[PDB]
Each structure stands twice: as structure tokens, then as C-alpha cells.
Amino acid sequence: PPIGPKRGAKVKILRQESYWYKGTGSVVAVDQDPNTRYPVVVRFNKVNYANVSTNNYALDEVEEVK
Amino acid sequence: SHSVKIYDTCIGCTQCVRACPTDVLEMIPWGGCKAKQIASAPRTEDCVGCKRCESACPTDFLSVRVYLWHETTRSMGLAY
Amino acid sequence: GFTPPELDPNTPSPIFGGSTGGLLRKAQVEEFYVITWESPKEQIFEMPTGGAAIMREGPNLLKLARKEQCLALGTRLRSKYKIKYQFYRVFPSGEVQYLHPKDGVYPEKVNPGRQGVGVNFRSIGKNVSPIEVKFTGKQPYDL
Amino acid sequence: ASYKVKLVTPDGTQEFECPSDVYILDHAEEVGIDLPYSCRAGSCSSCAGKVVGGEVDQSDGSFLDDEQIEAGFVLTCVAYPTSDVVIETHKEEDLTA
Ligand code: SF4
Ligand code: SF4
Ligand code: FES
């Protein structure tokens, strides 16, 4: 049993200080090793103000959409 | 002296420490990330407040933050 | 645990012609800084205040007026040349203070003898509203 | 398309297959040969490495010297392997100098 959403899923962001907040992104890797507080790696379709397109997130800041 | 704070979303890329022009920041060992690294700010009495560190941080939102505070001789960058 | 070097005066200085950018009254009454390095040979380099100087073969000792001057000079010396430098803060009392590198290693490399100063264990979006700290002298990021 | 990749590494040298539209790092992530990363966004030097042969697409690479892409170093996480490549891993500091 692994953790988190599946690889390449479609998830919605709930971290309101995020640029992509209430938007969606695609999972690319979920660090399985505990002691990491932000395992999920999400890649987005648009860049933010710092010209970055990927970010780490916790498990509860991510909600699977369909 | 300004304030500089490090938040636990840090990925330990060290880009902020490389950028500081007055050597305020430092890397210290940790266990909360793949790098086992975290930034710290032990020498904030020398911080000029340029936010050169914030331009370098890649996390969203920032993991290093500079709050401008009471001014001194070193903080203002006065050579006289 | 890494005794820091001592300041060895009688260390020579680079070959400079003088300039209107050097020390001022603040160095007489408040503080100034001193950088020292190695210089395998004699070479020319850009002064962080004015024109160009010649560093001598062997130890070199420069007196500047700001920490940022010392650190910019050290960055130039460390990348473009392959040179080790240290700098110090001297008071009008005649008191030295080894400044950098603090614990012998450069701060971009993690050393196991360091404590955390100014680290909050949460995201930046989880600071309280200012209304929570009103009339008490703390700040929302203090926590 | 899906050219074979070669990575020298302190663990050894292993190969995995993976299409040209991908970044090297997620593809070494697929088969499971662990590599060092911090950013996954092309804004640091933990995923640094150099090449033995061929050359890798560095279009979406940034925060690099106007030379780091003409004398060997490459960031594995923003790189497209246009050819059957042979690359280095754990190459940050001899890049960091
Ligand atoms: S604001 Fe400037 S001087 Fe202060 S810690 Fe950041 S980079 Fe250093
Ligand atoms: S730039 Fe940001 S993420 Fe990188 S080490 Fe500094 S505080 Fe941490
Ligand atoms: S993690 Fe630093 S470049 Fe990919």
C-alpha cells in the first residue's frame, strides 16, 4: 500500500496562499518516505509570477477531482 | 535590525544563502525534506534588507521572508 | 571546535595609490573591517571602492568600512581567483572579531554543529491575523 | 522517441527507456534508480550533471551561466533526452566549484 493520490492524477489545490489555488494540476511523484511534510509533487499548466510551474504539497491540501 | 524567518515549506535548495550580500543566512541539518537541509538566519544584525534572498526562493509561496524593522547604522548601509 | 585564526598585523597591504573612497570618521569612532587572503602571486584586481590595486605574493590585509565591501571583495576573490579569505570587525577600542567564515565552513554547505535561528515550523499562510496580536507587543510572524 | 538513457552513478550505471517528450528525472523515477533533486523546477543545482555523449534539450532551463549549457553541465529535471544519451549524476559541486 502506497500513500496519496495516484501518479498522473488530476487534483485540486486547497492552499490559499498558492498561485494555483482552487485550480487543478497533475501529480508526478508522491514521496513515500514519512518525515516529509509535503510529499506530493504537482505540475501545472501555467507559470506563476516567479516563472515556476511545479510545487510540493501536503496530502490534505490536495483533493482529487474527476 | 530587520527580521528574517524561515518556514517549514523549505526544500533546502540553498539558493537564498548564496545570494545574501552580508552573510546573514546559513544551512543547518534537518530531517523534513529530501535534502535533509534547512535555512537559518543567525546574523540578522547585519541584514540590509535587500530581499535578494526572496527573489531566489522557488517555493510557492515563499519559504524565506524579510520583515523590515527598526533601522541602525549597519542596516542603512552607511559608510560614514 | 574550530578555533578561529588570529589577526596577524604587520601583514602587508596591496599596492594602492590612494583614493577618496576609503575610510572616514565612522572608522575612527564606530567600527571598521579588515579582510585577509593569500594571493599565490602578485596580481591586479579591482578595488571595491575605486580603481585597481596590486595584491602582493603572500598574505594580504585590507581595511574597509563596511561588511558588504569585504563580502563583495571576497566573492570576487573566491570565484574568479581560487583564494581563501577571512574578515574581521575592529572597534575603536582595539578589539578584533573574526567574522567570516564563522564556523570554518562556508554557509552554503551544511555543517553539523549549527543551531536553527528564526525557523517557524508551519507554512507562511498560517500566521494569525493582526487582530490577534493587537495591544501586545509581539508580531504575527514572531510565532 | 524513447531512446535509451545511460547514467553513471556511485550506485553504478543503469539504463531505462523513456520517450523524448519527458524530463530525465521522472524517468529515472519510473524504473527506480534514485537520483538527488531539490527543486524539480530548474532553479537550483542539486539535479546537476554532465554528459558523455549526445546532447540534451535544455530549452526550458534557467538560472544557469551563459556557458553551463555549452561546456557540459545539465539539470536533469528540466531536460529532454533528444538522443540515446550517456550522462552523469551527483554532479552539483564540481559544477558548484
Ligand atoms: S534581505 Fe538581503 S541582506 Fe537580508 S537576509 Fe535577505 S539577502 Fe541577506
Ligand atoms: S531559497 Fe527558499 S527553499 Fe531554498 S534554501 Fe532558501 S529558504 Fe529554503
Ligand atoms: S531539483 Fe534542483 S534542478 Fe531539478
From Swiss-Prot, chain B:
Compartmental location: Plastid, Chloroplast thylakoid membrane
GO terms, molecular function: 4 iron, 4 sulfur cluster binding; electron transfer activity; metal ion binding; oxidoreductase activity
Catalysed reaction, written as an equation: reduced [plastocyanin] + hnu + oxidized [2Fe-2S]-[ferredoxin] = oxidized [plastocyanin] + reduced [2Fe-2S]-[ferredoxin]
Lineage top rank: taxon: Eukaryota
PROSITE patterns according to UniProt: 4FE4S_FER_1, 4FE4S_FER_2
Secreted keyword on record: no
Example of a GO biological process term: photosynthetic electron transport in photosystem I
UniProt domain 4Fe-4S ferredoxin-type: residue ranges: 1-30, 38-67
Coiled coil start-end: none
Keywords: 4Fe-4S, Chloroplast, Electron transport, Iron, Iron-sulfur, Membrane, Metal-binding, Oxidoreductase, Photosynthesis, Photosystem I, Plastid, Repeat, Thylakoid, Transport
Binding site residues for [4Fe-4S] cluster 1: C10, C13, C16, C57
Binding annotation for [4Fe-4S] cluster 2: C20, C47, C50, C53
Pfam families: Fer4_21 (PF14697)
A GO cellular component annotation in the UniProt record: photosystem I
Gene3D superfamilies: 3.30.70.20
Main location: plastid
Cofactor note: Binds 2 [4Fe-4S] clusters. Cluster 2 is most probably the spectroscopically characterized electron acceptor FA and cluster 1 is most probably FB.
Membrane topology: Peripheral membrane protein
EC number: 1.97.1.12
Cofactor: [4Fe-4S] cluster
NCBIfam families from the UniProt entry: PS_I_psaC
Functional note: Apoprotein for the two 4Fe-4S centers FA and FB of photosystem I (PSI); essential for photochemical activity. FB is the terminal electron acceptor of PSI, donating electrons to ferredoxin. The C-terminus interacts with PsaA/B/D and helps assemble the protein into the PSI complex. Required for binding of PsaD and PsaE to PSI. PSI is a plastocyanin-ferredoxin oxidoreductase, converting photonic excitation into a charge separation, which transfers an electron from the donor P700 chlorophyll pair to the spectroscopically characterized acceptors A0, A1, FX, FA and FB in turn.
Subunit description: The eukaryotic PSI reaction center is composed of at least 11 subunits.
Listed name of the protein: Photosystem I iron-sulfur center
Swiss-Prot record, chain D:
GO biological process, one term: electron transport chain
Keyword Magnesium assigned: no
Superkingdom: Eukaryota
All residue ranges annotated as the 2Fe-2S ferredoxin-type domain in the record: 3-93
Family, per entry: Belongs to the 2Fe2S plant-type ferredoxin family.
Function field: Ferredoxins are iron-sulfur proteins that transfer electrons in a wide variety of metabolic reactions.
Record's protein name: Ferredoxin-1, chloroplastic
Organism encoding this protein: Pisum sativum (Garden pea)
Full-length numbering of the shown residues: 53 to 149 of 149
